[PDB]
Design a protein around this ligand. Sequence first.
Ligand SMILES: *[C@@H](*)C(=O)N(c1ccccc1)c1cncc(Cl)c1
Ligand SMILES: *[C@@H](*)C(=O)N(c1ccccc1)c1cncc(Cl)c1
Lengths: 306, 306
Amino acid sequence: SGFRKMAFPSGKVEGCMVQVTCGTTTLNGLWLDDVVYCPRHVICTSEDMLNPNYEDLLIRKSNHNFLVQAGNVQLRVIGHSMQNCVLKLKVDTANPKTPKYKFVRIQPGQTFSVLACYNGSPSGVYQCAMRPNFTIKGSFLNGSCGSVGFNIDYDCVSFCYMHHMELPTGVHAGTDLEGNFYGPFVDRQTAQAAGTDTTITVNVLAWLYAAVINGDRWFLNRFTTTLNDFNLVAMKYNYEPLTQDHVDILGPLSAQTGIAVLDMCASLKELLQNGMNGRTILGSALLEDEFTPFDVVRQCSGVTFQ
Amino acid sequence: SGFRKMAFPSGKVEGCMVQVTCGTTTLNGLWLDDVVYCPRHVICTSEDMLNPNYEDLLIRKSNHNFLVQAGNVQLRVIGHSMQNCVLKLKVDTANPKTPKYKFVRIQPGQTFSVLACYNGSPSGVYQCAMRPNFTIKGSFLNGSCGSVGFNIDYDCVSFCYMHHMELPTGVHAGTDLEGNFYGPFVDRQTAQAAGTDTTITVNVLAWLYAAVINGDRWFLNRFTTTLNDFNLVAMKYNYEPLTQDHVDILGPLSAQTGIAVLDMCASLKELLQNGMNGRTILGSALLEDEFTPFDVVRQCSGVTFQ
Ligand SMILES: *[C@@H](*)C(=O)N(c1ccccc1)c1cncc(Cl)c1
Ligand SMILES: *[C@@H](*)C(=O)N(c1ccccc1)c1cncc(Cl)c1
């Protein structure tokens, strides 16, 4: 029992983190086989990151302008190319710690683990969700760009995020590992802002099921609701719509607890309309929306990775 | 910016986890140099864990009664001994992945990372605090016993916790790595219960400083308080006393923010007396007490580990 914001073991990713330096700019890179991936804004100085022409900045660079450090061991760069917003640095040594991996792009609503890094050295690991507005509520300081987000499935690391920037509200934006930004953000200095967010409804429902599995039942009730009537209430409280696929995905958790999905929707309705009245759910006084149905099944059932 | 429940990178500990099997009992062990550490209740069956005489149970065992698996590679046990509530299994191979380590015992109020494991295979990583009542609010299923808690300081892993059992309220108890339980718990079947807990005051204050550093200031006020007058209020709300050493420890965070410690106490007072009035602090609607002053400095300043 218990329920925690739980990340994947980070060791497989720790063995890929390196430090990339170009001029006075130092950030983090990801070393898989004989390529180091990193943000292309590694080639920018302070005045460069205003309206940068990255193609122009890159043709002015040489292989020897890039220093890659894997621990205390220097990696010789033998090739470089730009792909969207990431740089690909060909090095003369393949990483012997390369795990089985994929480059995947995730959906808003999905979760992943983040291994925060500084100067190529891992600092901490935590769980994040992709917000509906394509930002993430991360924890990142200066120098963290290049840190990656990932999921692990058995032995295989699915890299889904590379960190680039902080937005003015303190939230974070970055790219998938092909260099394509999540959401309407660019790797330059503009007035870009997050734009409005919503609560991830299916995840809140998953977490209420997590609570029932763990013995919190005070918020249950005898009422039911229709999907349409629930969706009317969700829209009023800035929750995103619930679909029949969301209902289907919640099926196993429904069947394990004996609580129909639309019955749990009725509970969520009351919670939105009445608040929590001085009580808590899984140690929280807010409706938590950063656990997916998969996350709940994994933690309340117990799947490992090798 | 941002503030997350952040664990240490787990890779150094992943390389020490093994599976230990005795009869039909399978759990997790920690392999450092040529010793595997695990709970001594590995030698108990179902009827054994009622009023077990562990000395009697152990003398009946042989080296070959213990199967240790490190991945898909079997480890030959060449010696065994009991030390308090842990078993020490001497194996014929030293773990080549042994990090620099220490066995430390932590204080209630301190935090650590937990690498949850099943069948010797890591499942997830998260942050925990030692509660004042010496339990931990973990996330553990059957088979997790033997999982360890730890902190990392540069390159050195300080192991502080080995998981043993779940108590009836869903919280968890275990030992330090010398086999000595945290709190008044025993590795047998009794009606043992957690006993009353308190909120870790110095940690709440640290977290309010974390919030100010990150831009939440709504809870600040012009009032101050004396240490004695604050401690009168804390006792009424089941917070533990704040000492002059707590005030000293909060010094750097006070100086970084320009908010005197006793001024932040005045804010906490008002928060305890008035609630949070529909607002949140660092994304939480409760006063959070599982970050130490060290945790806040590490995350809001950015220290790594190698
Ligand atoms: C990612 C990175 O290294 N950035 C810096 C920081 C300082 C000098 C050059 C580059 C960075 C950080 N945040 C946003 C952007 Cl566009 C670049
Ligand atoms: C730690 C462990 O392996 N336990 C079991 C579980 C099933 C059979 C034997 C031993 C265990 C779990 N929780 C409490 C205690 Cl005293 C033992």
